[PDB]
Amino acid sequence: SGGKAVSGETPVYLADGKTIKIKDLYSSERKKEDNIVEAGSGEEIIHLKDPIQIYSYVDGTIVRSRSRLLYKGKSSYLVRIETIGGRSVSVTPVHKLFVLTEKGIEEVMASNLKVGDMIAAVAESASEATFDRVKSIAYEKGDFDVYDLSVPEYGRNFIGGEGLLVLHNA
Questions:
Q1: CA–CA distance, 137 with 115 (Å, rounded to integer)
Q2: Most buried among 120, 146, 153, 155, using CB within 10 Å?
Q3: Residue from 16, 10, 2 nearest 145 by CA
Q4: E strands along 31-157, which residues?
Q5: Domains of the chain, start order
Q6: How far is it, in rounded angstroms, from Cα 77 to Cα 14?
Q7: 110: left (phi over 0), alpha (psi -120 to 50) or beta
Q8: Helix/strand/coil for 23
Q9: Hey, CA dihedral for 134, 136, 137, 143, is it positive or negative?
C-alpha cells in the first residue's frame, strides 16, 4: 500500500496448501495472457484475471481471501526481523506489524519496532494467535526489489514470512 512492501523472498501462503515466494508468484503471474500489467516510474502492478487465493487473519481466525493486484517496486531499505521463535520477515521500513502491549494490540512500523516487542504470528496447529518476542532487527541499505499484494476484506492482514507473521499491508 503506502510504500508498504516485503522482500521477494517472503513466503505467502496460498489456500491450496502451497507455499510460494512472493517474487516467484509475481514473476509467474506477470507472464499470463489473462492478466494486465501496468508499469510506471519504477513501480509495477499486475491485475489478476483469477484472484490469488490466500490466507488473511481476522480477529483470532484465519480466513480465506482473494487477492486481485500484485505490486513490485524498489526500496533502498529493508528491515529484517527475527523472533525468538524462529520467525522472520524482511520488510520495507513503513510496513506495519502488530504488537501486543500492556494496553492491548497496536500497529507499529517496522522502523519503530524494538527488540523485545511481541509481534503477531499465526500458529500452524489451529491458527491460534501467538505473539513472539523479536530477538533481532536489522537495517540494510541496498537496491531491493520489493513486493506487495492486496488482501481486500474485513480484517486487512496478510500472512507471510517464515512462521506465519501477520502483516498490516492495508
A1: 7
A2: 146
A3: 10
A4: 36-40, 43-58, 61-83, 88-91, 96-101, 104-109, 118-122, 129-149
A5: 1-170 (2.170.16.10)
A6: 27
A7: alpha
A8: helix
A9: negative
